[PDB]
Ligand binder design. Structure first.
Ligand SMILES: OC[C@H]1O[C@@H](S[C@@H]2O[C@H](CO)[C@@H](O)[C@H](O)[C@H]2O)[C@H](O)[C@@H](n2cc([S@+](O)c3ccccc3)nn2)[C@H]1O
Ligand SMILES: [Mg+2]
Ligand SMILES: [Mg+2]
Length: 138
């Protein structure tokens, strides 16, 4: 088990056919989780499960440029369960990130930041016990 917040280095950034796997367990009274794929201070892809926005569970995705959040993309399909182990897989494709949770497709997010090979860090934070974070080429 790792300590959160955790930084996974992505040296040489990301590239199509890269598969990033995050394994953990949601804490029993969880409020939020965040993955932040970063290009310096910019957040190319923010993936933000919210467990209690208006007694609603929702996943918010966005990009932060020059410390300004852009237009949100939201997904109400919500595969995370408090207390339960999860696997997030982020597959990099030429035109978007493709996200699956527990082996089921969840969402896609088109690339707004285009220099994939400079998205050189993944920050993992929030209300989880983080077991491992790694990547490979499929
Ligand atoms: O767009 C994505 C961003 O959303 C904003 S909230 C946004 O605020 C708008 C007005 O500016 C409203 O109009 C929108 O409706 C509403 O969604 C979040 O604060 C922003 N964030 C989330 C997080 S971690 O959870 C987190 C990190 C540290 C401590 C605790 C939690 N770190 N940064 C991001 O998720
Ligand atoms: Mg496409
Ligand atoms: Mg498309």
């Amino acid at each position: 088990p790792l300590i959160v917040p955790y930084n996974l280095p992505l040296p040489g950034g990301v590239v199509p056919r890269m598969l990033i796997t995050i394994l953990g367990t949601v804490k029993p009274n969880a409020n939020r989780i965040a993955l932040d794929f970063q290009r310096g201070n910019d957040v190319a892809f923010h993936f933000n499960p919210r467990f209690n926005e208006n007694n609603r569970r929702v996943i918010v995705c966005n990009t932060k440029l020059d410390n300004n959040w852009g237009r949100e993309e939201r997904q109400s399909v919500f595969p995370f369960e408090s207390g339960k182990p999860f696997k997030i897989q982020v597959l990099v494709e030429p035109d978007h990130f493709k996200v699956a949770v527990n082996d089921a497709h969840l969402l896609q997010y088109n690339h707004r930041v285009k220099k994939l090979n400079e998205i050189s860090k993944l920050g993992i934070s929030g209300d989880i016990d983080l077991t491992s974070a790694s990547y490979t080429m499929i």
